[PDB]
Design an enzyme around this catalytic site. Structure first.
Site, PDB file in Angstrom:
ATOM      1  N   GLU A  94     -14.264   7.400 -10.830  1.00 49.21           N
ATOM      2  CA  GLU A  94     -13.469   8.066 -11.850  1.00 49.21           C
ATOM      3  C   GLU A  94     -12.320   7.190 -12.341  1.00 49.21           C
ATOM      4  OE1 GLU A  94     -10.293   9.523 -11.590  1.00 49.21           O
ATOM      5  OE2 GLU A  94     -10.377  10.547 -13.537  1.00 49.21           O
ATOM      6  N   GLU A  95     -11.862   6.238 -11.535  1.00 49.19           N
ATOM      7  CA  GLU A  95     -10.707   5.438 -11.902  1.00 49.19           C
ATOM      8  C   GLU A  95     -11.031   4.224 -12.764  1.00 49.19           C
ATOM      9  OE1 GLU A  95      -7.420   6.214 -10.960  1.00 49.19           O
ATOM     10  OE2 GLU A  95      -8.373   8.129 -10.476  1.00 49.19           O
ATOM     11  N   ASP A 155     -15.486  10.208  -6.806  1.00 54.16           N
ATOM     12  CA  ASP A 155     -14.168  10.556  -7.304  1.00 54.16           C
ATOM     13  C   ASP A 155     -13.224  10.373  -6.127  1.00 54.16           C
ATOM     14  OD1 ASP A 155     -11.872  11.641  -8.463  1.00 54.16           O
ATOM     15  OD2 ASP A 155     -13.057  13.139  -9.573  1.00 54.16           O
ATOM     16  N   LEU A 183      -9.977  10.625  -5.371  1.00 54.70           N
ATOM     17  CA  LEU A 183      -8.984  11.642  -5.007  1.00 54.70           C
ATOM     18  C   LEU A 183      -9.005  12.711  -6.100  1.00 54.70           C
ATOM     19  CD1 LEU A 183      -7.305  12.470  -2.710  1.00 54.70           C
ATOM     20  CD2 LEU A 183      -5.305  11.469  -3.785  1.00 54.70           C
ATOM     21  N   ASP A 184     -10.021  13.567  -6.035  1.00 57.96           N
ATOM     22  CA  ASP A 184     -10.174  14.620  -7.022  1.00 57.96           C
ATOM     23  C   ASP A 184      -9.057  15.639  -6.868  1.00 57.96           C
ATOM     24  OD1 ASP A 184     -12.404  15.652  -9.023  1.00 57.96           O
ATOM     25  OD2 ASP A 184     -11.533  17.411  -8.047  1.00 57.96           O
ATOM     26  N   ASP A 244      -3.854   8.185  -5.788  1.00 58.36           N
ATOM     27  CA  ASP A 244      -5.183   8.071  -6.375  1.00 58.36           C
ATOM     28  C   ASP A 244      -5.593   6.617  -6.544  1.00 58.36           C
ATOM     29  OD1 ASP A 244      -3.255   7.560  -8.388  1.00 58.36           O
ATOM     30  OD2 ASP A 244      -4.460   8.498  -9.958  1.00 58.36           O
ATOM     31  N   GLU A 262     -18.631  14.258 -10.119  1.00 57.38           N
ATOM     32  CA  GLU A 262     -18.145  15.594  -9.798  1.00 57.38           C
ATOM     33  C   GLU A 262     -19.285  16.599  -9.811  1.00 57.38           C
ATOM     34  OE1 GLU A 262     -14.972  15.579 -12.911  1.00 57.38           O
ATOM     35  OE2 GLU A 262     -13.572  15.899 -11.293  1.00 57.38           O
ATOM     36  N   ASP A 304       0.815  -1.210   0.000  1.00 56.01           N
ATOM     37  CA  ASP A 304       0.000   0.000   0.000  1.00 56.01           C
ATOM     38  C   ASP A 304       0.852   1.265   0.000  1.00 56.01           C
ATOM     39  OD1 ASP A 304      -2.957  -1.090   1.954  1.00 56.01           O
ATOM     40  OD2 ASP A 304      -2.332  -1.381  -0.152  1.00 56.01           O
TER      41      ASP A 304
END
Ligand SMILES: Cc1cccc(S(=O)(=O)NC(=O)Nc2snc(C)c2Br)c1
Ligand SMILES: Cc1cccc(S(=O)(=O)NC(=O)Nc2snc(C)c2Br)c1
Ligand SMILES: Cc1cccc(S(=O)(=O)NC(=O)Nc2snc(C)c2Br)c1
Ligand SMILES: Cc1cccc(S(=O)(=O)NC(=O)Nc2snc(C)c2Br)c1
EC number: 3.1.3.11
Lengths: 317, 317, 317, 327
Positions: free
Chosen positions: D89-90, D110, D112-113, D66, D272, D60
């Protein structure tokens, strides 16, 4: 004025006008100790249990890597390593460090207090560095002490100037000086040893402990405490007074604790605090070691208590 | 799958189809414990020592205030308060909580392990809430356990579903389930008591300890451990097995430990883990209290060990 | 090899063979920064909201008290204090420090990145220390830098040896060297200023910005970024290249940023990183101040970008 | 009385007498946000830089933030037993939760925007929107193709100078400060409402050559007011959670509009625009594409983009007047 370990050590170095290596060594140790404390407190354990889908080895690697990278050491003796570690040439400094990176960790599964013990020597010869550079009596120590990972984390540092205790503030990663020039009580009221092994006791140990429980005069029996982790039991002895014993017997004529990185640093802390530390036959700090992992008996704490033990010890000699 | 205290408790509540008060109570307790752990580990101690130019009271205030504001309690008994605290009408719920907010803190100056002990009862009478609502035998407990601020911080929670152990991950302030449905060893190899009171022991205690040091079957002697902090000694007993004793002595003729918020919660944890807890005359959980701060002798731990003690107790009538 | 701020600073000091005051000053500052970071991240905010029943002032007090207690300073200029603070004689050293303890804190209610900015000068004369000792051009800076309390906390330290960036590891409260001898891009692709003041812009600024949106050499338009917190905007300029502007406007005919503890340290960091910092008329580091709180216009960042602005500035005579 | 996120959510759940799944979902998310915050603040970074040698770095710890954040949110939501479809988002495709861990909620997030610029330590954040699955079909990607009007709850965590969770539900918007000494989110601002009209506008003006003519005119009105009032200040962090949160706390307007090159905007509707629009509307603000309310767009693709103009109602209404003038 607030005082940190970093500021304290650097001010001792300035007054002595050394080369600065000992100061760098102590900074590296302090960093390693904070990292051990973080891991001992289980920072990040959620990741081990799958939140996103060894402790004594890690502690040893932290100490080893921080001391090597200090450029202040040339020979490192650890409880975790069969042989002394020789620092690579381009990083060698003048100090020898003997340490137990996570003392008491055998019983760390019950979350008992654990600790780190260290003793620092100057290398005496210009010979190629080797295990023999660590074969010095504890009286040669330049600095020694321990970190206790208890209810809070405390670093106890003994040097020629005496004994000073620093509390780790984990909110900012600073060791804060909280007890200056500490001295142990002349006589305590607690004895500390594993009485489960009483059937193997040396007859002198049996008699001394019996006098603590059944005093021949009209005084109160001593209390008993035995954490089973040397740093916790020694630190309590330092703070409250009394006596700590891991003595010799017929089955273990040299005791069980290790001279280089358990007995000697604790003996040094004790004497700098006005305490005593004896094998029964001599001061711990006067034993000249022949083996980096050799054992030594240790009886330490308040001088009146240790002297009384020696009185009983002689009676059976 | 990773499991947290929050998720675990909420899932137990969903299955039981209760009103949710016990869940809110336990959420509040968990929050208070994390706040106690942070202060015990000395977060912010540098501000106390002037970087910008009592622990058991604060701990009591955290538990008191978190419990009051849970709207789940009506009567609170703490080691820190002479009288039971009656929650104001607008915040009253159905539970009575007896707790020791910072057990073992008398010796926290040597950084010995400390802990928080708690026991939760349903208020049983329909009278206006009062100190008598806490005078229930331990067998009435709905839930009990402790937080140990040792080398790491762990919460042990015992309910009807059994005993579960959660490690506090301080990086994220989450209690992570690490040991499910814990059961104590049937028989251990450690005994734990303050042997400084040997001059005051009843003959049954004296004989039992003598059997641990000099076994009549010529098996290996038990080791001895005594931290002096009940939460640490009991947690080691749970994790490694064995026996913990605090019997009566001349200073403490009704015993030393407090029935309401030391013996009963530990006895409940022990029994839910397949262990035993006795005064010598009866099970701790069967004692009916008359006073919220009354003391009790306690012998607890592995069932074979406590049963052996009871055979010795009966031999001496 | 891992390196810490403490070890790094001490090694620079050993090589220079100074008196050690600058090292003790930098250690004290580092400690103050870790304490500000802890408060900025709201450690302990639960106690403020009643769990047991100003930020820029605290930041100023932390910096003030740590610098005073370093025994390394004699004159201290802060954004928070109308007059220079003269350190009392028993704590005096030879350095003058100008600092902004919590830059950007006016908008901290939206949790915008904030930072600490500092510049360190040597006092030259044997006179009694006074406010006039801080009236030095930036060229006289011995050391300067900033701490950014962003998504993570980073200390950027510029000395004659160049610029080095240290990440605060909050698990252990240690600044870890993560970028050595930093150099800014020769030319960036981001411009940074508050375009809400477009009505007041000097024609040179207006034209320069128009060149960023409608490039004359057929390149891609620059992106715009403006956090409104100087440390965040300057740090991005250092990391990604580009240009930062705070030119004069009607409210601020000499600009808005403060010369002594905003413009000069950032100008010094930029220049040691191979960037530039100009008022439009001269290098920021060459302005000789007459008032400790005097303001200066500032345009800084990648050399090609600043030179392009200066070419436009000269075109407007 | 002090109030925590855990206690607050549980009390809203008790009053509604739901099944408890939504509460478990929100507990799991809260745990994930605390772990993201710890990693974003670089807890343990010394190990990456060799403090324990070139051996003791974990799986980790080596992951980019992200990826790690996505793994935290994904795993915590799966283990909540409250979700059946997860959109990130990923991930190109929706994640269908395995049958034995399924609950009734669809979550778009999202993780880690703003992380593209995390190298400058810019504020970053986590954005989330929670839907109830509507159809009786086996769960599938189509279950996330719901208009923002259908949201049960939404919000964001901002990893700024401090870490804050902003949670919007039918009861309104509440702001919780993370106390990292104890890992508790402390309720610090209740039932938050945005200013009717602000004094800050927020957009990337470097791309002005590509602006829609309505955007050009509106921005010109903010910098050169026709009524001789004070020009608006400008702020643009480049990280949506930071710019939107400042808009919520201080008022004003945030724009990521369409143009000829990007006729549907740049920001993503599902994880978002919609959550931010939901928070804004629950705070008495507005969020428009220019043509309609963001929350009224019915998506056909889980990664479709949408233009967004949001903030104080007076500011957004003034913008819409200019937009209508340009038809
Ligand atoms: C803790 C300790 C005690 C004694 C000796 C040392 S030392 O050998 O490391 N020397 C130094 O640190 N000298 C230093 S420190 N700052 C200056 C300016 C100088 Br000269 C360290
Ligand atoms: C730990 C524990 C065990 C038994 C009973 C309780 S309780 O009385 O607090 N009840 C509940 O929690 N009910 C809950 S929780 N979520 C739902 C949907 C419901 Br119905 C708590
Ligand atoms: C960061 C820095 C750079 C240059 C000069 C300094 S200094 O003036 O503070 N001097 C020192 O640190 N001398 C030191 S440090 N250890 C020794 C043994 C000595 Br001699 C600090
Ligand atoms: C935050 C939120 C709002 C509305 C609905 C929900 S919920 O659907 O998750 N239901 C519950 O939480 N029920 C609960 S909680 N404790 C009890 C005793 C019960 Br019945 C959660």
């Amino acid at each position: 004025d607030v005082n940190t370990l970093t500021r304290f050590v650097m001010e001792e170095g300035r007054k002595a006008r050394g080369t600065g290596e000992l100061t760098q060594l102590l900074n590296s140790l302090c960093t390693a100790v904070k990292a051990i404390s973080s891991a001992v407190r289980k920072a990040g354990i959620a990741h081990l249990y799958g939140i996103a889908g060894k402790l004594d080895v890690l502690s040893n690697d932290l100490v080893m890597n921080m001391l090597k990278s200090s450029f202040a050491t040339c020979v490192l003796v650890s409880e975790e390593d069969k042989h002394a570690i020789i620092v690579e040439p381009e990083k060698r400094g003048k100090y020898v460090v003997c340490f137990d990176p996570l003392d008491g960790s055998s019983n760390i599964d019950c979350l008992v207090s654990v600790g780190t013990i260290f003793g620092i020597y100057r290398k005496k010869s210009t010979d190629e560095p080797s295990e023999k550079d660590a074969l010095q009596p504890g009286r040669n120590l330049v600095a020694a002490g321990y970190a206790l990972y208890g209810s809070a984390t405390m670093l106890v540092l003994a040097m020629d100037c005496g004994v000073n205790c620093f509390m780790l503030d984990p909110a900012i990663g600073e060791f804060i000086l909280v007890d200056k020039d500490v001295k142990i009580k002349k006589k305590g009221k607690i004895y500390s040893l594993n009485e489960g092994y009483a059937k193997d006791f040396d007859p002198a140990v049996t008699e001394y402990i019996q006098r603590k429980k059944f005093p021949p005069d009209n005084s109160a029996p001593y209390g008993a405490r035995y954490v089973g982790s040397m740093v916790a039991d020694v630190h309590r002895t330092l703070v409250y007074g009394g006596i700590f014993l891991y003595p010799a017997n017929k089955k273990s004529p040299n005791g069980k604790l290790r001279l280089l990185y358990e007995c000697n640093p604790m003996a040094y802390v004790m004497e700098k605090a006005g305490g005593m530390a004896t094998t029964g036959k001599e001061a711990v700090l006067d034993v000249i070691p022949t083996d980096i992992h050799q054992r030594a008996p240790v009886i330490l704490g308040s001088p009146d208590d240790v002297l009384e033990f020696l009185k009983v010890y002689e009676k059976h000699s």
